[PDB]
């Protein structure tokens, strides 16, 4: 039979970070795939 239960931290999923650029142009995030 199976052993002891395991203590665990609750995960926090960080959002993908995107840089906020200086001046007249900027990075833009766009998906390249999708699913229904």
């Amino acid at each position: 039979v199976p052993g002891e239960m395991r203590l665990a931290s609750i995960a926090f999923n960080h959002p993908i970070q995107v840089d906020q650029l200086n001046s007249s142009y900027f990075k833009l995030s766009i998906p390249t795939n999708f699913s229904f």
């Binding site: 199976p2 052993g3 002891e4 239960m5």
Partner: peptide, 4 residues
């Protein structure tokens, strides 16, 4: 614990 994990499944059988």
């Amino acid at each position: 614990d994990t499944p059988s």
